[PDB]
A paper describes a structure:
To understand how [name] recognizes F-[name] through its [name] domain at the molecular level, we utilized cryo-EM single-particle analysis. We used [name]-[name] (residues 1–201, Fig. 1A fifth panel), the minimum construct that can bind to F-[name], and obtained a high-quality density map with a local resolution gradient better than 3.0 Å, as judged by the FSC curve. The [name]-[name] domain in orange interacts with two adjacent [name] monomers, thus following the [name] helical pattern. At ABD1 (amino acids 13–31), the N-terminal loops or helixes of the [name]-[name] domain mainly interact with [name] (n) by hydrophobic or electrostatic environment (J and EV2B). At ABD2’, the n + 2 position of [name] Y143, I345, L349, and n position of [name] M44 at the D-loop form a hydrophobic pocket that enfolds F108 and F109 of the [name]-[name] domain (E and EV2B). ABD2 had electrostatic interactions with the n position of [name] between [name] H87 and [name] T129, [name] K61 and [name] E133, [name] E93 and [name] R144 (F–H and EV2B). The longer N-terminal of the [name]-[name] domain forms a ‘hook’ structure to catch to the [name]. We also found the [name]-[name] domain is far away from the [name] D-loop because of the rigid 310 α-helix; this way would result in the weaker binding ability for [name]-[name] domain with [name]. Our high-resolution cryo-EM structure of the [name]-[name] domain bound to F-[name] provides the first example of the single [name] domain interacting with F-[name].
The spectraplakin family protein [name] was originally identified as a growth arrest-specific protein, and recent studies have revealed its involvement in multiple cellular processes. Its dual interaction with [name] filaments and microtubules highlights its essential role in cytoskeletal organization, such as cell division, apoptosis, and possibly tumorigenesis. The [name] family cross-links F-[name] and MTs, which is essential for the regulation of axon morphology, cell apoptosis, and cell division. Notably, the [name] protein is the most diminutive spectraplakin, comprising a single type 3 CH domain and a GAR domain connected by a hinge linker (H-Linker, first panel). In summary, our research revealed that the [name] protein can promote MT nucleation, facilitate MT stabilization, bundle MTs or F-[name] together, and crosslink F-[name] bundles to MTs.
Residue numbers in the entry:
A (entry chain A), F (entry chain B): 13 to 78, 95 to 166
B (entry chain L), C (entry chain K), D (entry chain H), E (entry chain J): 5 to 374
The structure:
């Protein structure tokens, strides 16, 4: 960060731009999901094509074979169906030893409010799935 | 290889890696729990929140601090704050990294024992240490002699050190700090008809004191000035767009550090307690302590407090003593940057408690190494 | 497998299947019985008529609403309306489908108990649920924060919701809605010499209200404008081909929502009940409620009501707040749209009251689960 | 020369002469104004009504309380209530007699300042005083050690006093009292089917509360007993001969004193608020406070409240402590009885504010003498 | 006339008449002043309290000792303690009675001069004397040879005496006694999480010290026993009914007498200081000093201190010497018993300073007679 | 007292039973007050009929005749009127030049907590009154 040079600039960095290494974190996961889902992801499109929860239900359905989970793949963005898909996926994470630190809430994907916690969830799932025959993120 | 440093104060967590210039994470030491009936399903919600996440949605939450007066009073909520620190805010895996923690002097022994146990058993840390907060403020201020005055959210303390030797009989502790001043500001804002009651409204008056409060150089002259004129009155906008206007409440709040009688307690005040610990030191040490009063912690951040402290100690100390106050602009982080300095030293790497010493002596190892 | 959804309001039944975009059946909540000798020809002699066939034959009938102020007052006529809904409008066996019903807040407990009993004992549904109408209107709005104002034929209510949590101490009810506005239009149409008296003539005045009435932006200037000129006057054709001309009665009727004393009530009016409900909420929630006032129900369909509401709340709230009124063109169906969304969710299917757990606990289970 | 004493609360005015055993005047602290058109010459109409005459005519009036939470919110209507008190009830010229007024602690300073201004400018009293009303409850109790709990219509507070010395940092305030319980009983009567809406119907529910409500010793056993049997149900006749029947609403209403969560508050309840005030006192004072918890004011009049308070504090305090609750038969009047005692004492006569030292200092004289 | 004897040490006043076997008055040498706001008029209340009355009211008082380290540091408060002694407790007019006072050795000359002045000018005694405390302990012991160790509430001293001759160059003094051990017990109870801070809470820790503390025969084996076992722990009930448990704090407090390093002093400790005083005496006197170590004063009252003292002195002295420690059951009163003996003797009656010698020579008469 | 023969017996004597000679001090004052005020007093009734302060106001007035002091003679025991009467008497003692030490507080008479300091006050007032023409206690 900016360091001690002045204390106002350091507090402005704590409040926002705090996590500027999020763009690097999206690039690893976009390529990993492009290999694993067979659907093309880029770090610019990453939130804009995950936000209906449908590809994350397909991620669980891909990783599990290596509960059955319900999903509406046709769900539009910003809907209660997009929330409900994402809530099934977050329940599949809670059944897999992830906890309320690394998890996002279903609103946090669907309205884009928690994109760091989406990456931390996908990375925690990757480290657990690595013990059961999945190649983890780069 | 590299250590991590967590200050872990009563009000704010400061955390980051050893050898960094400043903390990487700084967030409030609160957990919050929803206090209202949930009615919408599909929302994937947590049953508790911590840090800036709990601060952000505080209108639906009751807020709890696990630490009060520098003592961890709720261990189940402290383990959530430490888990959030290592896994969200720093992305560590603590199994790989030596951890430096910090504590106030004159704490109960069970606090550093259970803090040692949880690091080795819940987090599986390889090596661990608990430093005294005031000693880290001398590492940050680059010197081996001085009397530190440290005040945070819950504890005020002072520790005289000379040539790297502490004088533990002269150490002082005072259970008046920023939370007591926040509660006294809530009490005196009722004189103007403002009512602040919920744990979320306490966080509003904490922001009011951080923005608008200051230390008077002469208190009776400011009381006469504020009685005679509106010239000292200022306004603050509440989160719903209402405006409060405050006057002498701006300096009557911080004056409680110099007059603990205002919150009902039989205690000398911040100027008398540092003079009294200089006078408990040997006569040949005192001149170098008067020249090296070092201020530390966020409760020392009020405008005018160093000029007030300079004035008050000069009236107590002998004429021809040259009393000096060191109050640097980064002093709200000087415990953490002092821990970052200390954990980096090549001559410190023998001092850690390692996991294989804890497997021999248990939690009791913390009383003989720290 | 599929679920039924019934709005079942004081004025109209709106009914269909969960996951559809709109109700398939929409008809008046009326039962009609002959007011003349029971030996009719051509009119199709049967004891009573429901909904659209009662509205069609109204010249020979007395008309009764089974429900008033959101409370069912004839249970045998309510069983006629539900029997018509499932067997004659939706063309279905209720034995096969979960049924989601709706209620206003602050209703008598006996109403949702007897409603639960009739669904399990008369219609023998496998499962059912009783939702709050305002929470469904927020599902249809696509959001988890807002103060919802609902107004149907019999009651108006508001519920503040924030992050999916309701604040049940901040809920308001007023038993002034569309039927009180119809009865007040019948009263003031007497000033021009028009007499409407029969229950069938109340349905003519309901149609005059729906087509000609609107909300004034400023009432004193609109009163002065209608006194000064004929330009605000409009005409309507009665079922017999006579014409009525209406003037200031056209906006004096809807003004009763903002001035309840026109019909003799002591209550504050809809701009004050929404504001007083925001001021019952915690201070950190209020800014997000001011930005999300969601309108709902057929009595919110008047031209100019959102512009009036925006003006009136902006005069109550602090000038730095950003007031928004959300009033979509679908808002007479948003309770049904919300029920269709909710009954379809994966995360809702554990929330139904099932027949076997009603057999454990009787009607009283509706208080623990809904 | 005889002094006047006036309780001047939210809800009720209690007033009379110092040295009398009880107040002469006791009437509701309301102003009433007509809400309907006076169609008839000599119908009996007058611009406004006060006290018992406003309570008597309430079917044609809107009713307003000028005091809320111990704060005077309408000064024109308080000046009307004081004019009624001196000239119609006591039948006194206030020009002749010194007057003792009373107030709750932690009130805004402008409220005391405006009280002394109106007594010296409008009523032209020779001398004036403003007592803290809980110190007067201890005068009436005949003791000089104890923690007083006072609850009227608008506020509840406690003051610990040790030997005529108050501990002002240990004083608590809770803006939950008798009016919040009346409004919660109105909300709860809607479950049973009864709607009370007007300011006149609030006075009916307030009479139901005073006659039918009681405090449960164990709330979950009374809830289970009420669910199991009709044995606890009671009936009440309304002013028009309709009959209310209620059961668990009788004890769910006053239970909100012990758990403020029922009306949405994030606040501890009256037993915890008494215990927390004792724990803010010096350790040597606490034994005599536990032996001397003194009840005061009309909201402490429920059947079973002293037995509940004894039980709840005994579960918080150490097992070797002797808990006692002093709850006098006359505790509805102990603020006024204490003012009648105090204003009569020969030693008190040099601590009035006189008209001459108000003409020197202005109304802010009240902050230095009282 | 009969003489009167005031021991008048830094912790307790012991007072009575010459020739009595015990003091008639024994009370704490404290003055106390209210620290809180008086709110009830009528009490006749005093602005200051003394002795057991100040100990009784201590929760509302700040307490001060006007003597520290055997020096009178507040003369205004010492004149109140002497006035309370003569007029309330001994109940006698000092103009009729010769008065014997006491002092520690190596005190400043101004202390006995000002004490001499006040007795002849404030109290107008006919005659006066100041004795050294430890020579009175030897009168009470009934012997003319021995080395006395006196320790109280601020000063420890020893004087070797042989055949009625003192050796002034061999007198030793430690300003570590009693009050320093109470302050160290307050410091050390923070390790258990108990916090004692007010002047009133120091009187609680002083009571805990008097009834739970003891001297270890071998400190390392008690530290090993207390680390290994709960069998050394005891409980104390605080004045509010809380219970504190203490363990090694029971013997770590008194060990400070043998290791002054525990409280930050460079000083030698009780055994070494006694041995060093004997070794400053002439070689042929030393045998009778080793046989006659006399213990005196309330800080010598700990269980096991005489057995520890005999063991520690035996390790310093030559193996052929017969070490004996004389520690009477009544040694809390030895100085007063010795003063009651001395003032009664027929050979002492020429040694008083009389008022006529003070009126000739002034206060400095006390350096040539005493 | 007990002497130092048992060291525990003496420390109880200092606190539990320090003035057994209180009754001898009440006996003289009861007969002196009976001579001076005409109201009949005995050492058993002494506290129980002084405790409303009224006869001590009559004492102040009688010793003054041989400030005007206000009094409510009808005051019941244990009241704030009994305190207020006694506070006027204690103020009259301080105007008679008595120091703060031999005096009682008004609670100490009215609740009977300080009967020693009541006797010390009456004796001190008696020795002052002897200089102004009233015969003192025996
Ligand atoms: N500008 C300020 N003015 C006054 N108080 C402040 C200010 N900024 C922060 N504080 C106080 O400083 C506290 C931070 O210190 P804390 O975390 O409790 O202990 P420590 O200094 O050991 O890390 C805050 O919680 C708050 O009470
Ligand atoms: N366009 C409109 N303009 C004004 N009032 C309307 C309009 N459409 C419907 N209403 C009125 O709204 C009420 C019906 O609203 P609705 O939401 O369907 O009520 P409910 O839920 O009780 O069935 C009736 O009083 C009706 O006359
Ligand atoms: N018997 C009672 N039971 C419950 N509440 C009572 C009772 N009698 C009086 N109250 C309440 O006391 C309040 C009267 O106002 P206020 O002056 O503040 O109280 P007070 O009676 O102590 O003078 C009202 O809320 C009233 O309903
Ligand atoms: N049982 C005891 N155990 C420990 N300390 C005691 C005990 N009893 C009394 N003390 C201490 O001894 C002191 C003796 O009184 P002090 O005034 O100093 O006169 P002195 O030195 O002559 O004995 C007390 O004030 C107290 O500090
Ligand atoms: Mg810190
Ligand atoms: Mg409807
Ligand atoms: Mg009242
Ligand atoms: Mg001594």
């Amino acid at each position: 960060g900016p360091g001690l040079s002045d204390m106002h600039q350091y507090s402005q960095w704590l409040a926002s731009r705090h996590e500027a290494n999020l763009l690097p974190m999206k690039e690893d996961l976009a390529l990993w999901l492009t290999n694993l889902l067979g659907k093309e992801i880029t770090a610019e499109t990453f939130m804009e094509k995950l936000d209906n929860g449908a590809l994350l239900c397909q991620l669980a359905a891909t990783v599990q074979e290596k509960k059955k989970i319900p999903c509406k793949a046709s769900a539009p963005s910003g809907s209660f169906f997009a929330r409900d898909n994402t809530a099934n996926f977050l329940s599949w994470c809670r059944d897999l030893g992830v906890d309320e630190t690394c998890l996002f809430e279903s609103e946090g994907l669907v309205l884009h409010k928690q994109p760091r916690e989406v990456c931390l969830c996908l990375l925690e799932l990757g480290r657990i799935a690595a013990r059961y025959g999945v190649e983890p993120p780069g | 290889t590299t250590a991590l440093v967590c200050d872990n104060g009563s009000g704010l967590v400061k955390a980051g890696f050893a050898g960094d210039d400043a903390p990487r994470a700084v967030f409030p030491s609160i957990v919050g729990r929803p206090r209202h009936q949930g009615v919408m399903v599909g929302m994937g919600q947590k049953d508790s929140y911590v840090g800036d996440e709990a601060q952000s949605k505080r209108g639906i939450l009751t807020l709890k601090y696990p630490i009060e007066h520098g003592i961890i009073t709720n261990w189940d909520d402290m383990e959530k704050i430490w888990h959030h620190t290592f896994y969200n805010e720093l992305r560590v895996a603590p199994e790989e990294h030596p951890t430096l923690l910090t504590e106030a002097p004159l704490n109960p022994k069970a606090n550093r024992e259970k803090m040692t146990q949880i690091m080795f058993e819940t987090f599986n840390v390889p090596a661990m240490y608990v430093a005294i907060q005031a000693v880290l403020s001398l590492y940050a201020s680059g010197r081996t002699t001085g009397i530190v005055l440290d005040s945070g959210d819950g504890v005020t303390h002072n520790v005289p050190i000379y040539e790297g030797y502490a004088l533990p009989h002269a150490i002082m502790r005072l259970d008046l700090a920023g939370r007591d001043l926040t509660d006294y500001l809530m009490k005196i804002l009722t004189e103007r008809g403002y009512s602040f009651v919920t744990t979320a409204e306490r966080e509003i008056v904490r922001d009011i004191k951080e923005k608008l409060c200051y230390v008077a150089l002469d208190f009776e002259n400011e009381m006469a000035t504020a009685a005679s004129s509106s010239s000292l009155e200022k306004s603050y906008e509440l989160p719903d767009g209402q405006v409060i206007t405050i006057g002498n409440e701006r300096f009557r709040c911080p004056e409680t550090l110099f007059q603990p009688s205002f919150i009902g307690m039989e205690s000398a005040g911040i100027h008398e307690t540092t003079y009294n610990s200089i006078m408990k030191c040997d006569i040949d040490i005192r001149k170098d302590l008067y020249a090296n009063n070092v201020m530390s912690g966020g409760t020392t951040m009020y405008p005018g407090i160093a000029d007030r402290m300079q004035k008050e100690i000069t009236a107590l100390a002998p004429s021809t003593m040259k009393i000096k106050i060191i109050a640097p602009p980064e002093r709200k982080y000087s415990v953490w940057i002092g821990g970052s300095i200390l954990a980096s030293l090549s001559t410190f790497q023998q001092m850690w408690i390692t996991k294989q010493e804890y497997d021999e002596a248990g939690p009791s190892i913390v009383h003989r190494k720290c």
